[PDB]
Design an enzyme around this catalytic site. Structure first.
Site, PDB file in Angstrom:
ATOM      1  N   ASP D  55       0.472  -0.738  -0.394  1.00 43.19           N
ATOM      2  CA  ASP D  55       0.212   0.340   0.011  1.00 43.19           C
ATOM      3  C   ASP D  55       0.877   1.146  -0.127  1.00 43.19           C
ATOM      4  OD1 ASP D  55      -2.171   1.898   0.278  1.00 43.19           O
ATOM      5  OD2 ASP D  55      -2.427   1.215   2.293  1.00 43.19           O
ATOM      6  N   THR D  88      -5.181   4.573  -2.614  1.00 43.81           N
ATOM      7  CA  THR D  88      -4.001   5.445  -2.183  1.00 43.81           C
ATOM      8  C   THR D  88      -2.591   5.562  -3.171  1.00 43.81           C
ATOM      9  OG1 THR D  88      -2.455   3.918  -0.613  1.00 43.81           O
ATOM     10  CG2 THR D  88      -4.437   5.159   0.848  1.00 43.81           C
ATOM     11  N   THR D  89      -2.106   4.574  -3.641  1.00 48.04           N
ATOM     12  CA  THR D  89      -1.187   4.692  -4.253  1.00 48.04           C
ATOM     13  C   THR D  89      -1.659   4.729  -6.216  1.00 48.04           C
ATOM     14  OG1 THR D  89      -0.591   2.435  -3.265  1.00 48.04           O
ATOM     15  CG2 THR D  89       0.270   3.003  -5.294  1.00 48.04           C
ATOM     16  N   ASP D 386      -8.462  -2.289   3.680  1.00 51.70           N
ATOM     17  CA  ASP D 386      -9.012  -1.850   2.716  1.00 51.70           C
ATOM     18  C   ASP D 386     -10.129  -2.381   1.989  1.00 51.70           C
ATOM     19  OD1 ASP D 386      -6.312  -0.853   2.921  1.00 51.70           O
ATOM     20  OD2 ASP D 386      -5.579  -1.479   1.826  1.00 51.70           O
TER      21      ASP D 386
HETATM   22  N1  LIG Z   1      -7.609  -7.500 -11.779  1.00 51.08           N
HETATM   23  C1  LIG Z   1      -7.236  -6.286 -11.846  1.00 51.08           C
HETATM   24  N2  LIG Z   1      -7.159  -5.732 -13.452  1.00 51.08           N
HETATM   25  C2  LIG Z   1      -6.707  -4.616 -13.773  1.00 51.08           C
HETATM   26  N3  LIG Z   1      -6.414  -3.593 -12.884  1.00 51.08           N
HETATM   27  C3  LIG Z   1      -6.984  -3.690 -11.707  1.00 51.08           C
HETATM   28  C4  LIG Z   1      -7.144  -5.029 -10.658  1.00 51.08           C
HETATM   29  N4  LIG Z   1      -7.792  -4.127  -9.742  1.00 51.08           N
HETATM   30  C5  LIG Z   1      -7.032  -2.958  -9.639  1.00 51.08           C
HETATM   31  N5  LIG Z   1      -6.685  -2.324 -11.110  1.00 51.08           N
HETATM   32  C6  LIG Z   1      -6.346  -1.317 -11.071  1.00 51.08           C
HETATM   33  O1  LIG Z   1      -5.562  -0.419  -9.532  1.00 51.08           O
HETATM   34  C7  LIG Z   1      -6.048   0.759  -9.525  1.00 51.08           C
HETATM   35  C8  LIG Z   1      -5.962   0.481  -7.590  1.00 51.08           C
HETATM   36  O2  LIG Z   1      -6.304  -0.562  -6.914  1.00 51.08           O
HETATM   37  P1  LIG Z   1      -6.273  -1.191  -5.356  1.00 51.08           P
HETATM   38  O3  LIG Z   1      -4.540  -1.767  -5.891  1.00 51.08           O
HETATM   39  O4  LIG Z   1      -7.412  -1.994  -4.595  1.00 51.08           O
HETATM   40  O5  LIG Z   1      -6.202  -0.055  -4.090  1.00 51.08           O
HETATM   41  P2  LIG Z   1      -4.435   0.548  -4.606  1.00 51.08           P
HETATM   42  O6  LIG Z   1      -3.932   1.226  -5.401  1.00 51.08           O
HETATM   43  O7  LIG Z   1      -4.703   1.457  -2.524  1.00 51.08           O
HETATM   44  O8  LIG Z   1      -3.991  -0.664  -3.959  1.00 51.08           O
HETATM   45  C9  LIG Z   1      -7.617   0.667 -10.020  1.00 51.08           C
HETATM   46  O9  LIG Z   1      -7.833   2.134 -10.318  1.00 51.08           O
HETATM   47  C10 LIG Z   1      -7.625  -0.859 -10.685  1.00 51.08           C
HETATM   48  O10 LIG Z   1      -8.201   0.347 -11.879  1.00 51.08           O
END
Ligand SMILES: Nc1ncnc2c1ncn2[C@@H]1O[C@H](COP(=O)(O)OP(=O)(O)O)[C@@H](O)[C@H]1O
Ligand SMILES: Nc1ncnc2c1ncn2[C@@H]1O[C@H](COP(=O)(O)OP(=O)(O)O)[C@@H](O)[C@H]1O
Ligand SMILES: Nc1ncnc2c1ncn2[C@@H]1O[C@H](COP(=O)(O)OP(=O)(O)O)[C@@H](O)[C@H]1O
Ligand SMILES: Nc1ncnc2c1ncn2[C@@H]1O[C@H](COP(=O)(O)OP(=O)(O)O)[C@@H](O)[C@H]1O
Ligand SMILES: Nc1ncnc2c1ncn2[C@@H]1O[C@H](COP(=O)(O)OP(=O)(O)O)[C@@H](O)[C@H]1O
Ligand SMILES: [Mg+2]
Ligand SMILES: [Mg+2]
Ligand SMILES: [Mg+2]
Ligand SMILES: [Mg+2]
Ligand SMILES: [Mg+2]
Lengths: 100, 541, 538, 520, 155, 51
Positions: D55, D88-89, D386
């Site tokens: 994160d 957050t990222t 999260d």
């Molecule tokens: N399985 C997936 N395939 C493609 N893009 C994804 C997938 N899961 C998440 N994302 C992308 O990653 C971004 C961040 O998601 P997430 O990792 O849940 O949040 P964080 O950046 O806080 O860890 C989202 O905007 C989404 O578009």
């Protein structure tokens, strides 16, 4: 892949090389010439005053004209050396008006 | 969880070695860091450019708004900058023109390629893209030529050649300095009905003698040269003989001594009495023959003895040292004589002619002037510079060296044809390359478009130094090329530049074809190397 | 990116972060590689103080030697956390994470992604959980087989100590564990089983005491040493002086009134002693034959000790919190705090109470109970490190054997579990599994990593590890076709296979389950990490 | 000399160049920490611990940068974490690009830093419009879709393999804290950790989980229907707010002073036995004399319990915070307690309190975590924050935006199309907003090993023609629509990402000079 | 034991010396293997005097950069003898030594002696010569054709 | 050649910690370490022993 723990960034110019951007440097160059100008301000005219200079070698040299006053004071700043070059050039070509 | 394991390849290369590879971020570190020095050459570009004061470690101060003179003295630790440094020096030594274009383009190709690398385009494809774009640029520049010159002899024809070069460096002085350089070239070139077969020209023909003091308008042209030297023996006649034969001896005027060391040996006093007169009669036999043919001037490179100077004073023969060897042969080209290390005797075929020699002070110091009228000269000239400061005269010398270097760039090849300047052909190349990118489908099309965007800095850099808005005159200039008349559109620099249109032929601003081709090639090769490297290995200190 | 931000920092990324986690893993593995197995080498730990402590437990080695690497501290918490609740499987977690990283790192060099590799470990882990159900065997606790508990106790004790200490200390654990099983079937280890240090004749003289032993005795000489029938009494009331919440001066006026007020110090103590005398009057019959003893959790005033000495009542003060929670289990009585409400029902029973002293210290022994619900294990030893070695051996032995009674299953060891998973993962049809793509090597990497543990046992014996598995492989090839379900082992005495069912080598159920679960989580998280850095304010 | 300044004043254009390079450097640290194939990050704090996570917020908490422009970028993660709890990222990686794309212009085409701000608010106003149009509503009561909505964020973490259990774990916890608008808060969500065990047997249980055991051994370890009563004062004899200072004269006073110490604790214990409770939970400590006579009535005494847990016990058992014991009644006594039981774990004892399960105050709960080690617990605990953060946005806002970069790519296309019709001086910064919104997709593609060149070219060709729900599959690296892919995220996270990223650029773009070392 | 003879001496024996030999070979392999092939990267040998030089041959990279580790000195000396007599293939030498030590150390950790491991390399080496002399092909250079020399030079 | 790698992966433990295995004749040294003070006990056993 890397050779060691960390890798500090390179400074582009050499370490200790002074440099500056903006309008601050040209104002400092103009103020440097005005600082040299104020030494020769009251010297101009028949009722003017002479200037006493004593260099590092401890040899007294009194003068009224600005040709040898600027030659004694070894000038570091390039902008202040412009007044010294024209004073020697005026002294070499004509021989009058080195202060004006 | 306090101290790291310290990268266990530390048994490999020593701590002084630094690796800055890619993936880590080398390209991002480099293209950026060099933006500081990119702004240095960008601000010093154009007729309104700002000169930069560079104080070296010795203390010799210089002030020059070029790029080759600046970067030579700058001790730069960054290795990727140094590829741009000596690449600019190649332009200085070969052509002597285009240092700044090289810097504002080689660096801009790296700056504008930020979009290609950041998007994720392969580095190998970018090199192939600019190489094929380089080939199209060289082929296309030949068609936009309208200055095919074939005379290249008269003085008025050089106004389209020298004055654009002099107008860049210290724009305020155009007619005066162009008169000095153009009149110098006319004295250099021989009088003939048709001089062809590639006549020889070199940068050492036109020399620069810097004199302290005096306004720039009071300068003049001298066919000979001027040395800061003290004559000895007598005052000249200045109109009596009407012409003077000048002998140039490599060896000094003295009794011929061997390389191996000897001394005087006298077995009796009879030789002691004759030794005082023997040295006088020895030189008299060799000196009397020189005066018979009427050699009114002798030049000996090494130190001349007092015994040889004494015999020459009574006959009224001019003497001169000239210790340096490079400037000794230039005096021979004026009179048209050969060097003679042998004493021998003067012959008519090997001895030249000189009209007159007169001595005065130009800037307070006594000098010797070799000006001659109605005489025959071949590849020799000088320009006496008068100025208020030595710092300013140093820039006039390099401006003249770049001016006469362009003459070497014209007469050495078969054609040094002109092109439209003042931001005219650069915007044309943007339209040519924009149309070329659509002809070839493929992944390399993005490289072709971004190669054209790098040429945008040439018009706006003249507008930025002019205190004008880039977002007004630059897009307005594109509307002028819509459609000859559209080719001669350029960037105006004046208080009435709100329209942004000024005809080129009113002031005759032009650039060289060979200079821009060599600049584009060295600029592309400079950007090719920086984009091709991935790992940079340093060392201690 | 970090050097222009932070003026001082260290950063490893994309090749050194992988080499660090593997190099630190192989380095820490080499430390605990030689200790694993019965013929492993001992390891002492001496600090700058000069004290000595000897044991083979990986937790003691990790939680006493300070470590600077960022990878090993996670292996230290993983090896410690698995052992702190289970009591066994410490070095097994280090060997799995120590081997699974290097066994996957060869394929990272080949160019396989870390994400899909760890995806293969997770789906392979679910196959091992399904295999534990078929691999385990049911055992009914109603039989109350004492021989089965003896063989389980020798599995852990043979690893730590030699056969001389194992044979004498094995039935000490079995007699303590035999009383754990009851009708309620509720396991209780910390309150019931305890360890106490005592410098005495030798480690071999460790004996089992059915009652609760105490580290204190009678202060006065005239108080009785030995008591035949001692009825205990629990009282958490403090019978010395109390300062009384801000109460201040006994403002005395005349000299006679001074000592008249000083005599009131005894009245608060005598008010509580009279309740003990009233209780003794109810149980006054057979006073020379029977006896009475009082055990207090807080201190007793020395003025009141003479009261107990005159009535021949044994006094013991300043007991632990745990001992008060154990007297009800041993003596069978009930606890009391206040002296107001007393009865004869709360008094316990004891068949023999005697004291023995050595040097300045004195110990009180209680035993010969009617129906003791708890007991103790008084370990003897020579040196301080001898007690520490017996501490870790008894601490790890009681937890290993206690887990067998928690569940109705037991896992045979001696490499049978790891060798069985090798053939299962290497012979199972992949179409039944849901993993596809580059998960081919992830199954082979984790399946091959389990083989390094049973040969680490062989590396301490000095035999060739690859050759002693040849007949093991040939045995299982014919065992499937022979229609005979048998489990092979690894006997280090002769360098040949064996059967753990008859030899008595066994292992608990939750040890191998939690070990692979904790090891797979740590090893997966270390593989996905591709950058190390240090930053913060200090 | 003059005032404490003028060491090296970074003024003019080079000052902003360092800020864009410094702001870009923050995003480069966590460039690989995005998407389903994201890499982990182990940071070493100087105290002695370790933080294992991916994160961006938890990474940037431990890092320390000695630069003032990068610290404003550091604080944006606290804006996202303490607003929703997810993405957050995404906030840090988008802003870097916005500051970077606007840079070309600042450096070269000389657009003043105020005209860019005016261009961004109209882009911000249009960004909320297209994000409102691209999002589709979803039913809140559908548990089948809610499980797939919760596991969208879990897919980018380590526990995607246990996603079948985590969605059931998070869904039951959110509905417990949810109050019947639909406001919930995570302060009652207990983050108690248990090192060791398997994730499969880990489950949420209604009620609390203490770290302590009973004091006296005779206390009942298994009660059918506990009746909990909370106490704030200690059972010890209160000295009082002023000194007593008893002037003793007679000998019968000191034993009386020590006897009333026994009778006062009898008086407070006897009135507690008027209602006859089974479990008495005291906030402060307890005395040894008082526990016996509470046991005579049948109560159970515990050690000092911090009032953070007693407030959870008040909502579970329905009791009230009580300090004055004389005013104890039968109505404020906790009831409807399911079961009482104490398990044996080698770390510490653990007392379980189960609820009968059968409006009123919102109920609390404790989520059991059975990880592999200590770092695995802290890793999984942040995943629940999260994962449970996603469940709040669908209740507060029924809108649901597409994931996989489809939402931000939709902002890129409409801003790019409308930039042509926006002719003027604002066209160049307005068109540069689309250049950064198409990077989030780029980052995802780069972490898959895909090629961003032809995929984004194929993306824009199909986005206008095919549908508005097109996106990139992070695992396979091919174009797959979000409708068939079955993964969706809330629209609230997309709003905070666009708002916080643009609002951060408006602050940092106004920076002219940097002067360090003035005073404390 | 060595400290009794010379207190200022050091010694790594039988596990620390093996990790040094393999890690130094893998560390030398990981840095220098990138130059192999046409798609390899260019290195800038920037010494203290500021001399810049581009190259991909492992001989000149190791000649200018002094080697601190004792194992990699033996590999650099092998590249010198390779470049001396032949002038090509230095990158294959360091990769083969790095991979042979990697693949061998995989089996040394399994409890195999180094003697029989090196015995297999020599039999495998002699077996490759009996494979190499059959694998080669003979051509007639008397024609002096330009097409074959161009494509061979282009490789 | 000028300097060894000085025992890599030594940062697993502190610099002050040292290992002493049975190899390198160290068990012989421990017997020799006993032999230092054991010879002091030779002059101190018996009636003719020296204090
Ligand atoms: N399985 C997936 N395939 C493609 N893009 C994804 C997938 N899961 C998440 N994302 C992308 O990653 C971004 C961040 O998601 P997430 O990792 O849940 O949040 P964080 O950046 O806080 O860890 C989202 O905007 C989404 O578009
Ligand atoms: N007799 C005079 N009457 C009026 N002005 C004078 C007279 N003599 C000199 N000056 C003025 O004094 C100024 C300074 O002259 P001075 O300093 O003596 O010469 P310099 O500057 O060359 O040394 C001149 O500009 C001149 O105009
Ligand atoms: N009066 C003018 N009007 C328009 N353009 C001018 C004028 N004077 C100079 N320029 C332009 O300024 C530019 C300066 O170029 P410069 O960098 O000196 O050439 P090079 O790089 O070949 O040395 C020239 O290309 C020229 O066209
Ligand atoms: N006498 C023995 N014969 C065969 N195998 C044994 C023997 N003693 C121990 N083992 C094996 O050694 C392994 C480790 O045992 P133990 O010391 O209890 O755990 P750890 O080494 O993880 O602390 C077990 O899997 C067990 O099967
Ligand atoms: N164009 C090519 N395609 C495929 N392989 C190549 C090519 N060029 C060279 N190689 C391979 O690279 C190896 C080494 O070649 P080269 O790089 O010339 O030597 P070195 O690695 O010493 O610089 C050869 O064995 C050859 O198989
Ligand atoms: Mg005057
Ligand atoms: Mg020019
Ligand atoms: Mg064990
Ligand atoms: Mg998320
Ligand atoms: Mg080769």
């Amino acid at each position: 892949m890397n050779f060691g723990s960390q890798t500090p960034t390179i400074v582009v110019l050499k370490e200790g090389t002074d440099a500056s951007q903006g309008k601050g440097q040209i104002i400092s160059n103009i103020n440097a010439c005005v600082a040299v100008q104020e030494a020769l301000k009251p010297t101009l005219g028949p009722l003017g005053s002479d200037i006493l200079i004593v260099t590092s070698n401890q040899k007294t040299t009194i003068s009224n004209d600005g040709a040898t006053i600027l030659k004694l004071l070894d000038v570091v700043h390039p902008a202040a050396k412009t007044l010294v070059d024209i004073s020697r050039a005026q002294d070499a070509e004509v021989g009058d008006g080195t202060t004006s | 969880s306090l101290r790291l394991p310290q990268n266990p390849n530390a048994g490999l290369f020593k701590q002084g070695y630094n690796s800055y590879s890619n993936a880590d971020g080398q390209i991002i570190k480099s293209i950026a860091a060099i933006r500081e020095l990119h702004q240095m050459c960008l601000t010093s570009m154009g007729p309104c450019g700002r000169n930069k004061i560079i104080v070296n470690h010795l203390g010799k101060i210089i002030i020059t708004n070029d790029a080759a003179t600046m970067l030579r003295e700058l001790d730069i630790v960054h290795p990727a900058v140094k590829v741009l440094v000596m690449a600019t020096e190649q332009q200085k030594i070969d052509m002597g023109d285009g240092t700044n274009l090289v810097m504002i383009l080689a660096g801009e190709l790296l700056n504008v390629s930020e979009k290609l690398i950041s998007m994720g385009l392969s580095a190998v494809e970018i090199i192939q893209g600019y190489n094929m774009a380089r080939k199209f640029t060289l082929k296309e520049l030949d068609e936009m030529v309208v200055g095919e010159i074939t005379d290249k002899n008269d003085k008025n024809e050089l106004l389209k050649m020298i004055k654009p070069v002099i107008s860049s460096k210290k724009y305020g002085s155009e007619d005066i300095l162009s008169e000095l350089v153009s009149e110098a070239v006319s004295h250099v070139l021989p009088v003939a009905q048709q001089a062809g077969e590639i006549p020889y020209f070199n940068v050492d023909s036109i020399r620069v003698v810097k004199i302290m003091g005096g306004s720039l308008s009071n300068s003049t042209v001298i066919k000979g040269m001027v040395f800061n030297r003290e004559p000895e023996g007598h005052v000249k006649s200045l109109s009596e003989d009407k012409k003077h034969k000048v002998a140039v001896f490599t060896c000094p005027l003295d009794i011929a001594n061997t390389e191996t060391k000897g001394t005087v040996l006298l077995h009796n006093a009879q030789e002691m009495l004759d030794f005082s007169k023997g040295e006088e009669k020895q030189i008299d036999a060799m000196m009397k023959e020189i005066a018979d043919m009427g050699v009114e001037c002798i030049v000996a490179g090494a130190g001349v003895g007092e015994l040889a100077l004494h015999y020459l004073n009574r006959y009224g023969i001019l003497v001169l040292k000239v210790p340096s060897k490079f400037e000794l042969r230039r005096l021979c080209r004026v009179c048209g004589a050969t060097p003679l290390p042998r004493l021998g005797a003067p012959t008519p075929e090997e001895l030249g002619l000189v009209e007159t020699v007169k001595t005065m002070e130009i800037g307070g110091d006594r000098v010797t002037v070799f000006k001659q009228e109605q005489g025959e000269i071949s590849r020799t000239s000088t320009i006496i510079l008068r100025g208020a400061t030595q710092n300013n005269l140093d820039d006039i010398e390099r401006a003249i060296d770049d001016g006469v270097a362009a003459v070497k760039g014209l007469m050495k090849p078969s054609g040094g044809k002109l092109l439209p300047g003042a931001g005219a052909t650069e915007i044309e190349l943007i339209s040519r390359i924009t149309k070329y990118g659509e002809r070839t489908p493929g992944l390399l099309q993005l490289a072709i478009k971004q190669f054209a965007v790098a040429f945008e800095v040439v018009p706006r850099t003249l507008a930025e130094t002019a205190g004008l808005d880039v977002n007004e005159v630059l897009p307005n200039l594109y509307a002028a090329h819509n459609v000859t008349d559209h080719l001669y559109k350029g960037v105006d620099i004046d208080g009435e530049s709100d329209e942004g249109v000024k005809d080129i032929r009113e002031e005759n601003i032009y650039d060289m074809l060979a200079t821009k081709k060599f600049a584009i090639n060295v600029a592309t090769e400079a950007a090719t190397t920086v984009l091709s490297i991935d790992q940079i290995i340093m060392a201690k200190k | 990116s970090l050097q222009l931000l932070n003026p001082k920092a260290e950063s490893l990324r994309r090749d050194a972060a992988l080499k660090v986690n593997v190099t630190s893993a192989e380095g820490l593995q080499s430390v605990l590689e030689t200790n694993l197995g019965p013929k492993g080498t001992l390891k002492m730990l001496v600090d700058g103080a000069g004290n000595i402590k000897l044991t083979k437990d990986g937790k003691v080695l990790l939680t006493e030697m300070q470590i600077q690497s960022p990878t090993a501290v996670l292996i230290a918490r993983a090896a410690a956390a698995q052992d702190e609740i289970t009591g066994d499987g410490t070095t097994t977690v280090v060997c799995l994470v120590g081997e699974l990283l290097r066994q996957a790192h060869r394929f990272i060099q080949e160019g396989v992604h870390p994400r899909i590799i760890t995806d293969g470990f997770e789906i392979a882990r679910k196959e091992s959980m399904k295999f534990l159900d078929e691999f385990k065997i049911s055992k009914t606790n109603l039989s109350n087989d004492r021989e089965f508990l003896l063989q389980v106790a020798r599995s852990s004790l043979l690893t730590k100590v030699d056969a001389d200490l194992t044979e004498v200390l094995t039935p000490i654990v079995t007699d303590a564990v035999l009383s754990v099983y009851d009708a309620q079937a509720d396991n209780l280890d910390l309150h019931m089983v305890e360890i106490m240090q005592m410098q005495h004749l030798s480690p071999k003289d460790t004996t089992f005491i059915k009652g609760l032993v105490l580290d204190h005795g009678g202060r006065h000489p005239d108080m009785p040493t030995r008591v035949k029938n001692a009825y205990v009494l629990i009282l958490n009331v403090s019978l010395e002086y109390e300062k009384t919440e801000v109460n201040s001066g006994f403002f005395y006026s005349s000299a006679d009134q001074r000592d008249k007020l000083a005599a009131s110090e005894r009245k608060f103590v005598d008010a509580k002693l009279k309740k003990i005398i009233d209780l003794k009057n109810e149980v006054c019959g057979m006073d020379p034959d029977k006896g009475f003893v009082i055990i207090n959790q807080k201190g007793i005033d020395p003025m009141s000790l003479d009261v107990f000495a005159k009535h021949n009542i044994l006094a013991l003060r300043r007991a632990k919190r745990r001992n008060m929670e154990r007297l009800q289990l041993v003596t069978g009585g009930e606890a009391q705090n206040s002296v107001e409400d007393l009865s004869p029902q709360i008094l316990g029973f004891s068949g023999l109470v005697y004291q023995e002293t050595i040097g300045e210290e004195k110990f009180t022994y209680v035993t010969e109970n009617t129906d003791p619900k708890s007991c103790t294990i008084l370990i003897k030893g020579s040196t301080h490190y001898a007690l520490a070695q017996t501490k870790d051996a008894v601490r790890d032995g009681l937890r290993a054997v206690a887990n067998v009674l928690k569940d109705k299953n037991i896992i045979p060891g001696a490499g049978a579990f790891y060798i069985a998973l090798s053939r299962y993962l290497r012979s199972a049809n992949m179409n039944k599994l849901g993993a596809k793509g580059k998960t081919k090597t992830g199954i082979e990497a984790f399946a091959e990593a389990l083989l390094v543990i049973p040969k680490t046992l062989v590396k301490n014996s000095g035999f060739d590890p690859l050759d002693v598995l040849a007949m093991v492989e040939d045995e299982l090839d014919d065992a499937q076709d022979s229609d005979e379900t048998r489990y092979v082992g690894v006997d280090l005495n002769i360098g040949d296979s064996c059967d753990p069912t008859i030899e008595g080598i066994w292992d608990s159920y939750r040890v191998l389950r939690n070990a692979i679960t904790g090891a797979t989580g740590i090893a997966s998280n270390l593989l996905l990490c591709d950058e190390l850095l240090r930053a913060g304010r200090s | 000399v003059f005032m404490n300044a003028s060491q090296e004043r970074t003024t003019g254009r080079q000052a902003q160049i360092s800020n864009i390079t410094a702001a870009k450097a923050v995003a480069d640290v966590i460039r690989t920490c995005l998407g389903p194939k994201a890499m982990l990050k182990m940071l070493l704090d100087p105290m002695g611990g370790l933080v294992l996570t991916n994160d961006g917020h938890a990474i940037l908490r431990e890092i320390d940068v000695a630069h003032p422009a990068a610290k404003s970028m550091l604080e944006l993660s606290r804006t996202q974490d303490e607003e929703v709890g997810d993405g957050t990222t995404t906030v840090i990686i988008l802003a870097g690009e916005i500051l970077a794309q606007c840079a070309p212009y600042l450096i070269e085409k000389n657009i003043h830093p105020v005209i860019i701000i005016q261009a961004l608010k109209k882009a911000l106003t249009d960004a909320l419009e297209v994000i409102k149009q691209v999002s589709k509503p979803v039913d809140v009561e559908n548990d089948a879709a809610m499980k797939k909505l919760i596991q969208a964020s879990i897919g980018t973490k380590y526990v995607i393999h246990w996603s079948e259990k985590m969605c059931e774990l998070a869904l039951d916890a959110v509905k417990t804290v949810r109050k019947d608008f639909e406001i919930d808060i995570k302060r009652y969500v207990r983050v108690e950790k248990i090192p060791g065990g398997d994730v499969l047997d880990s489950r949420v249980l209604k009620g609390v989980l203490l770290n302590k055991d009973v004091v006296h051994p005779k206390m009942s370890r298994h009660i059918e229907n506990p009746r909990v009563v909370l106490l704030d004062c200690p059972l010890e004899y209160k000295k009082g707010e002023s000194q007593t200072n008893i002037e003793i004269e007679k000998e019968e006073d000191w034993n009386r002073i020590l006897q009333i110490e026994e009778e006062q604790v009898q008086l407070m214990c006897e009135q507690i036995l008027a209602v006859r409770p089974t479990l008495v939970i005291t906030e402060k400590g307890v005395s040894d004399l008082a526990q016996h006579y509470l046991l005579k009535g049948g109560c159970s005494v515990l050690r000092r319990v911090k009032k953070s847990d007693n407030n959870r016990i008040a909502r579970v058992t329905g009791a009230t915070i009580v300090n004055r014991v004389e005013d104890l009644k039968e109505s404020d006594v906790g009831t409807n307690c399911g079961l009482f039981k104490v398990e044996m774990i080698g770390d510490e004892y653990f007392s379980f309190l189960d609820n009968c399960k059968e409006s009123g105050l919102q109920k609390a709960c404790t989520i059991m975590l059975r990880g592999g080690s200590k770092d695995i617990l802290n890793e999984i605990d942040r995943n629940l924050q999260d994962a449970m953060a996603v469940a709040r946005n669908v209740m507060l806002s029924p809108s649901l935006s597409p994931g996989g970069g489809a939402t931000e790519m939709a902002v890129s296309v409409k801003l790019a199309e409308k930039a042509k019709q926006l002719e003027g001086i604002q066209q160049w910064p307005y068109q540069a907003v689309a250049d950064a919104m198409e990077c989030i997709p780029r980052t995802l593609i780069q972490n898959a090993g895909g090629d961003p060149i032809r995929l984004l070219s194929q993306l824009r060709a199909k986005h206008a023609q095919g549908n508005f729900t097109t996106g990139i599959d992070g695992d396979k690296g091919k174009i797959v629509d979000m409708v068939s892919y079955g993964i969706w995220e809330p629209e609230v996270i997309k709003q905070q990402s666009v708002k916080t990223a643009i609002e951060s650029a408006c602050l940092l773009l106004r920076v002219d000079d940097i002067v360090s070392g003035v005073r404390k």
